[PDB]
């Protein structure tokens, strides 16, 4: 795919010059300028851009005409990078950018996904601590492993240098990145919808007195049914619509709306009910501060707040700033839920302690 | 008040007159029961796993 | 055998001096909390004055405070209430009320008609 | 051995309808609040079952209030001794405490505090909460017009006590009742607050013995013990 | 009057104390110097019971090692079957609070009885399938606390307002009515003969009845603090207490003296309930420091531990055949051991 | 997400990679 783009080209043209060989035409059709041209007489000649094949902005939109002689396309008027060359200078950054903010999500992915394998194990492994509320921890702290392995193994098939690049034209491939690239979406959406349950949980036992049996089903439902849906209402509606390679770019806009808007509908909700919560807290403490702030920072992180800034705030800021705020600092949401929800717990280290005095 | 008093009295009058023994004596039959029964309690020796229904 | 002794005692004039000496025996005194209990003539048991097991907490009732005064002494195993100044409203029997929980600062039963560990006391009696 | 295994299947029979009788109560015991309500014989305690309402050792009492069912579980025949039949009473949602604020035949005030603080601080009640009832408040405005009533001698902190300002009373009254009525909280929430545990609190209330007021006192208190209980676990408090 | 009495009373106790003294010739431990250890007794559960709601606060082994009926104060009554932890039987109760349950000797009835100051019979005869109350015991004043049966025709019980009666299930009438407590009884224990049963009080006093006559025949006053539980040695000639001054007591029904006392710094909280077995060797005493215990009734020192719990134990009853040891706790789960 | 909007970057910028090698090979 990354030198295979040229091949369809050649062949889509390669039965020219077979049938129209017998004209004569004073600029037959050659393979110059790595452009496939069509034999013509003299004065034909359309001004063309860059191959739609790249389609890229390249700064300008420039178009490449040349002239008909006798012996065939003597020069091209304008040159590719004049026309539409890249004009990149920024190259030389970019790539020290683009490869530190990936080994710093790379990594911060590793260690959540070893912190949470034995953080979903405490939790699963000890009998006094299954209640609803430790098995929606369970639940998060499972989809939290999810996304981790979606996102390390979306790399692998789309950012392997270990391989020779042949890329061979078998798309067994391609369906296997896209469904990679199926999963990552699938688990962030199961990651965002994790934690919304969360603050449905801790704003149910807070208002109704009552809290149904039958509702943990519910809960299971939000949780993995309805990101499958999402996914559902993604892929059927970008498999024959926008059908392009292997689904990492997001260009169009439908394929992309439809599923920001389940995210941003959840990072919203959430943000109210924590809200509601905090006035709650603040009521029953009113008859300090220092513990209001205490428990604000224990509960920021496990309702997700952060994706609160950075999205609703236009991302006209470089589009650059957020990336540092979500896959660098937001990354480590793993590391901070795990550490104060199943480590830095007092009912699970006041069993943890026993276990470790017993042995 | 008085018949309260006559209760307590009449029954600790009793309570003077009871039979003594040296500790030792009484005592002597408190270990004598454990030797008794000591290879027949399944939690002193160790049960056999074919005659123990929790196995 | 739990067992209380109570002294003291005789006739004062209101406003005198005198003082209530509690021995204990059968048990370790230190544990216990240990608190005045006085009955007067036709009346219900009223509660007085506590010590604790050390002595850092003291309280009396209102009608005592500013009067009366409690003092523990786990060494020779006895309790002190000092009586001086006394008026010609708490003429009572005094019982040296122990509270039955060890190692504790909560316990229910001190002020009772069935309670089981409290003395005899003595009786008080002031008048002109 | 082939006859032992249908034995064993109507054994399992047996154990699979008594486990369905029970995962049925489940909800029923789960569902209901326990209220054990307690205090002085001498105050308004019958009067408050009673309103409640509208020879057995325990009197049972049912009601719903916004479709939540309380068992509130009076005292009936029992002895003065409360060491050992409130150590049962740990897993009720709260303990009611009504107390007549009578400061005469011997003073009232003094030995429900004391009993008071052998509730608060005990081993097993240290995780159950205390709702307080002070009834008989509008009996103060008719015992302090005495003069030299019994309210200023049982307890001389009372005369030199100055009314908290961030304190309202009921409107229609001098302030010295007002005084006199506060002063009585104050001596409770000294002891309320001064065990410092965290893990119950208490919630002191002004109430007459006759009125709708008590039964939705009582239900909002126990929400927001529920409430604060919800909160422990997730160590936000 | 009233001071000649008190004086004549207090001689006479000067008296019964000077007797009890005259008995006392050596300490237990000193003649115990055979008695070996019985070792490190690592016990580990084999059957854990779930079903209970709230907490067990006690339960009765069957008298075939199978059967173990467990009250619990969630309004419930579960006869379970150790072998295969099957419910065979869950009857309901109309007092929500249980104190205390009984296993009928034959295996055919059932009691209960709690602050409702009501001793209800069940009836497992079941000729109909459904089971009935046959009898409801009333006539107490405090509340009951433990009922045990002498036969399928003779109940005992203890309540809270210092009366401990003996009924009859065949009339419903009291035969005889045991009084002189001070505080509340709450723990009794019947013969291995069932002829005699003790009677703790919780102002600190053990006071062995009869049911022939119905007159107290020794009296004990050795705890210090409101008594907990008791039982009686295999031979049915003495009896352990446990009282909630952090102490374990041990009695004679002859020598009328503390025979052996075990206590140790570390353990500041009471005792909730005692057990032997049949050895007369492991004194098991469920205590409220979240962790039952096991003592030898020779050696008085540690010997395992039965740490599984979250709360209290107030129920801890080995088996008649000693196979196993079922225990249950506050935390509203019931657990078989067995060493091995 | 912004997970998706940086493999969109470098998706982008690894394309702008190869075509200015290749058009560097060619040109």
Known sequence: RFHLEIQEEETKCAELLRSQTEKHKACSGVWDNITCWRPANVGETVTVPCPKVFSNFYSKAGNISKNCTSDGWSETFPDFVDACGYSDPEDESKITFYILVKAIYTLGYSVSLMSLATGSIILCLFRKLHCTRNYIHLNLFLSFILRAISVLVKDDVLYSSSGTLHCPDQPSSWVGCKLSLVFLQYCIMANFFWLLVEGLYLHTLLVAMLPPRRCFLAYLLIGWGLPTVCIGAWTAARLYLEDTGCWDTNDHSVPWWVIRIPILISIIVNFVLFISIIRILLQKLTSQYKRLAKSTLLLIPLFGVHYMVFAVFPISISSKYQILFELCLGSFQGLVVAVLYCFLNSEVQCELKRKWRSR | SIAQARKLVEQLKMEANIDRIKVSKAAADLMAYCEAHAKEDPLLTPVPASENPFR | ?128 | TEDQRNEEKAQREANKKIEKQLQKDKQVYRATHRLLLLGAGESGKNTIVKQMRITSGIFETKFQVDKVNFHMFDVGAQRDERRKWIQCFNDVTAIIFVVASSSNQTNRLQAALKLFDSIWNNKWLRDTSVILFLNKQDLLAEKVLAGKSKIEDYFPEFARYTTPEDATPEPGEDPRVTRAKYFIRDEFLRISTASGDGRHYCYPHFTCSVDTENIRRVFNDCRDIIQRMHLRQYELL | ELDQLRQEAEQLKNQIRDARKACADATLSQITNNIDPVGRIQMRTRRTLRGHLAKIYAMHWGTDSRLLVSASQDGKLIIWDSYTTNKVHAIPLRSSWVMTCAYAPSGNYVACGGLDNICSIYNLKTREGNVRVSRELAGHTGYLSCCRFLDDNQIVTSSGDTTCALWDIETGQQTTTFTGHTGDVMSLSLAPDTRLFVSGACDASAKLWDVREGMCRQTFTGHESDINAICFFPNGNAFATGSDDATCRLFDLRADQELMTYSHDNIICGITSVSFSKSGRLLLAGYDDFNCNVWDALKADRAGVLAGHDNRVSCLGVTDDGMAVATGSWDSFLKIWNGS | HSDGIFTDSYSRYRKQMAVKKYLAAVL
Not at chain 3, 30 to 43: D, F, I, T
């Open chain 3, 1 to 128: 055998q739990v067992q209380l002794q109570e002294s003291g005692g005789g006739l004062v004039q209101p406003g005198g001096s005198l003082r209530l000496s509690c021995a204990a025996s059968g048990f370790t005194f230190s544990n216990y909390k240990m608190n005045w209990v006085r009955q007067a003539p036709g009346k219900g048991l009223e509660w007085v004055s506590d010590i604790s097991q050390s002595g850092a907490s003291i309280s009396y009732t209102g009608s005592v405070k500013g009067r009366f005064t409690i003092s523990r002494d786990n060494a020779k195993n006895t309790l002190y209430l000092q009586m001086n100044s006394l008026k010609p409203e708490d003429t009572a029997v005094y019982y040296c009320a122990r509270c039955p929980a060890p190692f504790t600062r909560d316990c229910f039963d001190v002020t009772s008609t069935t309670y089981a560990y409290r003395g005899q006391g003595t009786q008080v009696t002031v008048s002109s």
